[PDB]
Amino acid sequence: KVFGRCELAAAMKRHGLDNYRGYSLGNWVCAAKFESNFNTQATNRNTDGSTDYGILQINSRWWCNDGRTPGSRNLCNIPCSALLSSDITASVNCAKKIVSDGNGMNAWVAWRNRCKGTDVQAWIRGCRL
Ligand SMILES: [Cl-]
Ligand SMILES: [Cl-]
Ligand SMILES: [Cl-]
Fold first, then answer.
1. Which residues touch 122 (CB under 8 Å, ≥6 apart)?
2. Which 3 state secondary structure label does DSSP give 126?
């Protein structure tokens, strides 16, 4: 599924991401945009051999099990394939564990480089939330 800008803002708001650990909704929509371009089916292989899955590109090294990331952890206790679904529940719930692990949204390389220090509120502007 490819989400529209506001459709995803509402999906994430409904799932309790708005101001989760102090990260406003704008931050989450911005990260989703530059990580996946709002496509739940996005996959990217890292150089180490792990793969990033879905709308927030959760890494198979730490967070999910894809059966081919050797010696890796599964800290969200989920099949990586559960993060490609048009239902963003697994991605959101696992995202909540990632952002709580001490480094906040600095976990997301695209957020840190393209969303941090910008007017993220613009990513929800004109949405009925
Ligand atoms: Cl915001
Ligand atoms: Cl990366
Ligand atoms: Cl980046």
1. 26
2. coil
Residue 40 structure tokens: 């739940």
Q: Which ligand is nearest to the CA of 57?
A: 2
Q: What are the catalytic residues?
A: 35, 52
Q: Which of 92, 97, 45, 93 is nearest to 73 (CA)?
A: 97
CB atoms within 10 A of CB 99: 24
Q: What is the 3-state composition of the chain as percent helix, strand, coil, each rounded to the nearest 5?
A: 40, 10, 50
User: Distance from the CA of 71 to the center of ligand 1, in angstroms?
Assistant: 37
* Domains of the chain in sequence order: 5-124 (1.10.530.10)
Pairing of strands 58-59, 43-45: unpaired
Solving technique: X-ray
This PDB structure is determined at a resolution in Å of 2.1
